[PDB]
């Protein structure tokens, strides 16, 4: 079977499901290229993982992301978290663990929200 991994990203009610499989660098969001994600002002937000680790790593995989719920911003954050988590999971499962560590180090160095869900749970005081 084709090697594949699945991951989830969540921000408020926005949920993104990312499938990462062996491939030829085909990144899609809701059946469209990643370049067409909107709003354009926040597009680079979704690009943040792809640029942090370099496009070479993506050149060998296809990523398909399906997003539902929430608004524009929450969907953008869901997409980026899903892409990062899926990439790290794929490098864990079907590539060396050293690359996994390098990816985790880079992402947590830049923004830990890319991996850990940001849940603003209420705190009575």
């Amino acid at each position: 079977a084709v090697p594949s991994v699945q991951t989830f990203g969540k921000k408020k009610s926005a949920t993104a499901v990312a499938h990462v499989k062996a491939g030829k660098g085909l990144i899609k969001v809701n059946g469209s290229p990643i370049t067409l994600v909107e709003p354009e002002i926040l597009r680079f937000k979704v690009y943040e993982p792809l640029l942090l680790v370099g496009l070479d790593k993506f050149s060998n995989i296809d990523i398909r992301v399906r997003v539902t719920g929430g608004g524009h911003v929450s969907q953008v954050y869901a997409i980026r978290q899903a892409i990062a988590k899926g990439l790290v999971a794929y490098h864990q499962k079907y590539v060396d663990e050293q690359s996994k560590n390098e990816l985790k180090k880079a992402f947590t160095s830049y923004d830990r929200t890319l991996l850990i869900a940001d849940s603003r749970r209420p705190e009575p005081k």
């Binding site: 590539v95 060396d96 663990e97 050293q98 690359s99």
Partner: protein
């Protein structure tokens, strides 16, 4: 750590692979003659190489930079690196 493997070629190139997946990661090109020794310290930070041209290169494996270069009078035949004390001996041609 058992993650990387260094191969020294007779044409002066050092190729670094990953043992788990056998995928090439980095290639270092300083020596023009055959590389007769490679070693990496216990901390996986500073890397040292030697070649028949007589130069001993000092590398920073993390940053992939040339820390320094040392030229010896004669060609170098073999290398033994002691990780505990950070001393390495070189068997020179003379």
């Amino acid at each position: 750590c058992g993650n990387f493997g260094f191969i020294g070629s007779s044409n002066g190139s050092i190729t670094i692979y990953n043992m788990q997946s056998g995928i090439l990661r980095k290639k270092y090109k300083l020596h023009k003659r055959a590389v007769t020794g490679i070693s990496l310290d216990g901390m996986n930070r500073k890397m040292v190489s030697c070649g028949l041209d007589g130069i001993v290169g000092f590398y920073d494996f993390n940053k992939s930079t040339l820390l320094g270069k040392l030229k010896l009078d004669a060609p170098i035949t073999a290398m033994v690196y002691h990780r505990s004390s950070d001393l390495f001996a070189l068997a020179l041609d003379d």
